[PDB]
Each structure stands twice: as C-alpha cells, then as structure tokens.
C-alpha cells in the first residue's frame, strides 16, 4: 500500500491447497491496504487457445494467419478480444502479479499457459526493442507460487526431477524476465497432498508471513547462472 | 517399412512453415510405407482445459475435486471424456510420436500443453510407481520438432535466450521421459520468419532428409547433463 496486486489463479477447486493459498494472499494483501484483483481462470472458463477469434473486426492478412503479427497489429489498433484486453488492463495496473497454480508437467496448467500466450502479446508485454531487463512490464514484480506433487528431495540437481530452478527457466526467464518483470523468489510449496493437516498450515501460514514483507524483497538475479550454475 | 507414427500438430495456419514441416513428415513417412496419423489440434478445436467435464461418471470425491485423482479413477473405469480416449488410442498404437509446433514462451502452445495435461493421465502414461524409465509408454519414441522466432545464436549458452536445450527440459524430461518414452534428438528450425525463401526450403528439406533415416536413430540420454552440462 499504495500498491496494486493481480493474482492469476489456476485451480479448479476452491477447497484446494491452491485455493487456500490464493485466499490467504487476498486476506493478507487486503489487510495491508493493497488493491487486489483475482483472475480465477477456471471460473472464468478462460480461453486458452491462440486463435483468429482473438482479433475482432478484420485481419491484417486473411489469406495467411500469423498469430504474433495479427495480435501485435491488433494491440496497436485496439482490436483484441475483450477477454484479452480485460486481462491487459489488470496487468497494466498491477505493481505485483502473483501466479498461483499446481505444477502440470513441470510447467503451468494449460489454461494458465493460454493466459500467458494470449495476454502477454507483442506491443503490450514486449517489443523490438524492450525485452529482458528492458521488457515493457519493467517496474513490475512477478512471483510464481507453485505447488507440486513431487517432494523437495526429488527436485534437487541429482534428484529424479532435477533442481526446481530447472523447470522455472521458461516461466521466470523466458516469460516473466522477458516481458520486463523483476522476479521475486518463487514460492514453492512442495508436495502438500502428502503432508499432514498442520504442516500444510505451516506452508499456508508461511506464505501469509512472507506476504507481510513482500514489498521489502529484492528480485532474484534472473540469470542462466541463477537457474543452472554454481 | 512397418511402424506407426502419430504427429501431434499445433499450428493455426495450414500454409505456415509449421504446416510445411508437418506435411513433409506425412509425405516422407507415407513414402516409406509407415502408417501415419495427424492430430491437428486447432482444427479439432481440441479442449485444453483440465476440468471436471473430463470425467463422465460418479466422482470419487464430489466434495473436493482433484483432477489427477478423478482422471486416474476415470481412466481405470473407462469414464474419461471421449476426446481424451481418442488421443490415447492414437498414442497406444504409435511407435513414434512427433510433436510439431512453434515455440510459445519457451514451451508448447497452450492447446498442445492441454493435450499433454489431459491425454497423458495417470494409469495410461504413468503410474506411481511406474515413471521415468518405468513409465507406461516405455518402448515408444518421441521427437519434438520446434520452430522459433529467435535465431540459433540467441539460443546458445552465451546468447540472451540461453541454450536451446534448456527450454527442452520440462518437455523432454519432465513429460516425455517421465511417461517412459525414449526421446529422439529435437528438430529445431530456427527463425524461419527471418530466413530467406531459400533457407526455409532448406530447413523443410533437411527435416525430410532426416526422416529418411529416422528409424536408424538412437535416442538421447535424457539427463540433466545432456540438457545443462557439468
Ligand atoms: C496434469 C497434471 C500434471 C502434473 N504434473 C506435475 C509435475 O510435472 N510435477 C509435479 O511435481 N507434480 C505434477 N502434478 C501434481 C500437481 O502439481 C499437484 O497435485 C498439486 O500441486 C497439488 O496441489 P493442490 O492444490 O491440487 O493440492 P490439494 O490436494 O488441494 O492439497 C492437499 C490437501 O490440502 C488440503 N487443504 C486445502 N487448504 C488447506 C489449508 N488451508 N491448510 C491445510 N490443508 C489444506 C486439500 O483439500 C487436500 O487435502 C501434476 C498434476 C496433474 C493433474
Ligand atoms: C504467443 C507466442 C509466443 C512465442 N514465444 C516464443 C518464444 O518463447 N521463443 C521464440 O523464439 N519464439 C517465440 N514465438 C515466435 C514463434 O515461435 C515463431 O513465430 C514461429 O516459431 C515461426 O513458425 P511459423 O510456422 O509460425 O512461421 P511462418 O511465419 O509460417 O514461416 C515463415 C515463412 O515460411 C513460409 N513457408 C511456409 N512453408 C514454406 C516452405 N515449404 N518453403 C519455404 N517457406 C515456407 C511461411 O509461409 C512464412 O512466410 C512466439 C510467438 C507467439 C505468437
Ligand atoms: C502428471 O502428473 C504427475 C504427478 C506427480 O505426482 C502426483 C508427479 C509428476 C507428474 C512429475 C512429472 C514429477 C513428480 O515428482 N510427481 C510426484
Ligand atoms: C512472445 O513472442 C515471442 C516472439 C519472438 O520472436 C518473434 C521471441 C520470443 C517471444 C522470445 C521469448 C525469445 C525470442 O528470441 N524471440 C525471437
Ligand atoms: Zn532472466
Ligand atoms: Zn530425461
């Protein structure tokens, strides 16, 4: 406060561990006096497909469809579909975007992948130039709050899954850094379903505590070295 | 000769460079006498979202929906939605699965992510235990055939994007090897929008040429070292 937060939330069940994490984030950020908005993608039936329906009116080139060029032209000419533009208005206003999701195949669920693909379009989130340190959402913070089915030990460099930082790369680097975000340290809640009824409260109460001082945090160095190195 | 190939194809435009790559694969593998099937996800309006619509029977826990528990039970009972079981039959029959797509945010387009999320369910593609070298699709081969906006140089260890292998990890390892596939070396067709008409022709031809001998190939060692070094 005075800060705005967008929580993009991708879980089907409000009673889930993910739902609890989204709800404590709203509760704690609302208590601090921050402005809070939640894009509840499943409840919204959010469209994940990148298709020519994302441009309204008439196309730059209706013989050969190029999603990147069409949506770039459409963002410049204010003719993107209203579900996209609604989400761009949220992100444009936000000082922090928190993604809350269960890890699906070492990445985001498809409905959230579709939000990244369709809302983070050229002209809005990035351009030539304006990417990585210079991306168009520069100034803004982003944070992945991810839950996993695999344990922390599975997610080490010599573990069956590799270090968590390895799967973070396309999300933190290739997507958030790329668009300009400073990335806060991910919040990774390992294997909640196998944890006890408390312990899970440890993790929820722990995210609420972290959120108390989120605006004091320095963003990680979003480097190949941070992700893979020594 | 006597092999079955599934191509899971994710591009909106038949006239695109991805479209040319898919078509050359069909032409060359058809020429060789292989059995070929293509799942053209956008033309199928393939559903990417993981929702409770994917199970048609009585849920195990209708009070608190857990997509992974409900779909595992649905797969064992034969009560998954038919679009999913349609794709599982194609995968079960295939000896090789080629994924043909443009790189979206260092990953697959969300329509293809939802193919992975919904088709590769517990019981069918993996079980716990029954993953990585014990995954249920053991015996099968997979190959990612990717196109990029970024040049090969941008995709090297000291380029901006980092090495191309780094973005392959959640797909090759976290998804395909997790399900028991052996993974053939990726086909990466760099920056075809930047390339001349000639260089594009050569990249289509280079893919066709590689497919002539694809059944002679051995898979990669799908480890942390192969992807990251050290
Ligand atoms: C398609 C698919 C792909 C996947 N791919 C991967 C992958 O690549 N890698 C991987 O590691 N995992 C993967 N998973 C597993 C997935 O990441 C986990 O199942 C998910 O992260 C668990 O979080 P949840 O909210 O769904 O858990 P929940 O099951 O909702 O949480 C566990 C328990 O906590 C309860 N709970 C709710 N709120 C609270 C609270 N206030 N305090 C205490 N308990 C609470 C729940 O109701 C439940 O009993 C995959 C799953 C699917 C379906
Ligand atoms: C949401 C989104 C996210 C993206 N994220 C990334 C990313 O993370 N990293 C990245 O590097 N890129 C990214 N891109 C760029 C994208 O990967 C490239 O635009 C795409 O890979 C290029 O493939 P295409 O088929 O669309 O090319 P096209 O534009 O179709 O192909 C280039 C040219 O080749 C022509 N062609 C077709 N067939 C032939 C043929 N037989 N012979 C000669 N020429 C032919 C086409 O007609 C066209 O003129 C992103 C794009 C979008 C829209
Ligand atoms: C596809 O669904 C799942 C479910 C899981 O556990 C529930 C998984 C995974 C995938 C992967 C890729 C790694 C892992 O460690 N675990 C535990
Ligand atoms: C998000 O859309 C795009 C479009 C591109 O090029 C057309 C990109 C990228 C993303 C990324 C992340 C890296 C890159 O090198 N290129 C060239
Ligand atoms: Zn980075
Ligand atoms: Zn592997």
């Amino acid at each position: 406060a005075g800060k705005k937060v967008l929580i993009v939330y991708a879980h089907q069940e409000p009673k889930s561990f993910n739902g609890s994490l989204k709800n404590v984030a709203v509760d704690e950020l609302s208590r601090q006096g921050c402005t809070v908005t939640v894009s509840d993608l499943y409840a919204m039936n959010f469209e994940p497909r990148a298709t020519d329906k994302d441009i309204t009116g008439t196309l730059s080139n209706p013989e050969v469809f190029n999603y990147g060029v069409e949506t770039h032209e459409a963002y410049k000419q204010r003719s993107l579909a209203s579900d996209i533009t609604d989400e761009q208005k949220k992100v444009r206003e936000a000082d922090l975007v928190i993604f809350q999701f269960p890890l699906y195949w070492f990445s985001v669920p498809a409905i959230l992948k579709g939000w990244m693909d369709r809302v983070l379009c050229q002209g809005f989130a990035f351009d030539i130039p304006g990417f990585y340190d210079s991306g168009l959402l520069q100034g803004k913070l982003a944070l992945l709050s991810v839950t996993t089915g695999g344990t922390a030990e599975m997610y080490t460099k010599t573990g069956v899954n590799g270090d968590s930082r390895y799967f973070l790369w396309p999300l933190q680097h290739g997507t958030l850094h790329f668009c300009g975000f400073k990335v806060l340290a991910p919040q990774i809640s390992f294997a909640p379903e196998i944890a006890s009824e408390e312990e899970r409260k440890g993790m929820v109460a722990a995210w609420s505590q972290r959120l108390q001082t989120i605006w004091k945090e320095e963003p990680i160095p979003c480097t190949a070295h941070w992700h893979f190195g020594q």
Side-chain angles (χ1 to χ4, degrees), chain A:
Chain A
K3 305 286 186 194
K4 298 186 168 58
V5 182
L6 166 60
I7 302 171
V8 183
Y9 166 67
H11 202 285
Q12 305 95 340
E13 178 48 70
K15 305 182 195 155
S16 65
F17 184 79
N18 272 267
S20 299
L21 298 174
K22 180 267 288 178
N23 284 342
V24 303
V26 169
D27 288 348
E28 168 59 25
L29 295 162
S30 179
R31 186 198 66 77
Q32 288 176 25
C34 301
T35 293
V36 180
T37 309
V38 180
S39 284
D40 182 341
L41 299 186
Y42 291 98
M44 300 164 70
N45 189 217
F46 187 76
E47 174 61 63
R49 307 176 193 81
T51 72
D52 60 1
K53 298 182 196 310
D54 291 355
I55 301 90
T56 56
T58 59
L59 295 150
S60 193
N61 190 335
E63 300 298 73
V64 183
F65 183 72
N66 188 305
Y67 187 86
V69 172
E70 297 286 353
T71 53
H72 179 207
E73 281 302 297
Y75 177 82
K76 298 196 293 207
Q77 319 295 318
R78 315 176 78 179
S79 304
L80 291 170
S82 66
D83 67 333
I84 296 172
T85 65
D86 288 345
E87 292 308 297
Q88 293 179 337
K89 176 185 163 133
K90 302 164 195 183
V91 171
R92 172 181 298 110
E93 297 169 358
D95 294 295
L96 165 66
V97 179
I98 297 175
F99 298 85
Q100 177 66 57
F101 57 101
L103 194 67
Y104 283 9
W105 294 128
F106 276 36
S107 183
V108 287
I111 195 173
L112 178 45
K113 188 49 162 62
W115 185 104
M116 298 171 152
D117 291 352
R118 292 171 73 246
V119 181
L120 309 175
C121 81
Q122 182 162 21
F124 174 66
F126 66 93
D127 221 332
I128 51 185
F131 58 93
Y132 292 118
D133 281 9
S134 182
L136 310 185
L137 309 172
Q138 44 203 306
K140 296 192 199 287
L141 298 158
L143 186 176
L144 306 173
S145 176
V146 185
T147 66
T148 65
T151 69
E153 132 70 42
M154 296 184 192
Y155 289 99
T156 68
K157 313 194 259 76
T158 60
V160 283
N161 300 329
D163 193 306
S164 288
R165 300 196 190 184
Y166 294 164
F167 71 68
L168 293 170
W169 177 252
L171 296 165
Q172 286 189 338
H173 187 77
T175 306
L176 301 167
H177 190 173
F178 188 89
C179 295
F181 294 104
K182 301 147 204 205
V183 188
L184 303 184
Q187 179 76 186
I188 304 169
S189 300
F190 289 102
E193 295 168 283
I194 83 149
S196 41
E197 14 77 287
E198 317 138 280
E199 192 177 56
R200 270 198 261 106
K201 308 289 243 340
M203 277 186 299
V204 170
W207 179 222
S208 187
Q209 312 172 320
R210 170 174 175 188
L211 289 172
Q212 299 181 215
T213 57
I214 208 79
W215 307 105
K216 299 262 174 300
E217 293 183 11
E218 298 141 291
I220 65 157
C222 187
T223 65
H225 190 251
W226 187 89
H227 291 84
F228 311 115
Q230 185 62 290

